[PDB]
């Protein structure tokens, strides 16, 4: 029975599966800049 409140309701998907609806980027540098110190690394980490 359609009402004003239950008006926007669509039926669920047929397989009852909904759409799902990234990875880290690190701008890296050497810890103590004694040895290298002049390195820049743009990482793309996945954890």
């Amino acid at each position: 029975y359609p009402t004003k409140e239950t008006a926007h309701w669509k039926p669920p998907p047929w397989n009852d599966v909904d759409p799902p609806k990234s990875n880290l980027t690190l701008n890296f540098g050497p810890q103590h800049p004694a040895a290298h110190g002049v390195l820049r690394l743009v990482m793309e980490l996945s954890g």
Partner: protein, 104 residues
């Protein structure tokens, strides 16, 4: 009572050290400086849950030095080896189903 006095004294000395370490370097007026979700990992949460469940198994294991004093020693030894074996079986299922991977 003496425990509460000692806890209050340790808390007081710690708070005094923290209050000094925040307010003593504010004595020297400095040049006021005017220039100018996190990614989820499943393994980080899984190592914490594995910790929690093995810690509950440890909570079962903690009354053993009192449990050896019993007169029902055969039952006690059976259940003691059984709890340590179930902890080992939890570890083996955590092993073999790729649960301890990339934080091994």
């Amino acid at each position: 009572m003496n425990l509460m006095i000692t806890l209050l004294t340790n808390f007081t000395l710690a708070t005094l050290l923290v209050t000094i370490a925040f307010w003593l370097p504010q004595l020297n007026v400095y040049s006021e400086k005017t220039s100018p979700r996190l990614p989820f990992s499943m393994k980080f949460f899984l190592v914490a849950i594995t910790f929690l469940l093995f810690d509950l198994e440890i909570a079962l294991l903690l009354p053993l030095p009192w449990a050896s004093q019993t007169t029902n020693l055969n039952t006690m030894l059976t259940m003691a080896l059984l709890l340590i074996f179930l902890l080992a079986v939890s570890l083996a299922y955590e092993w073999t189903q790729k649960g301890l991977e990339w934080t091994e």
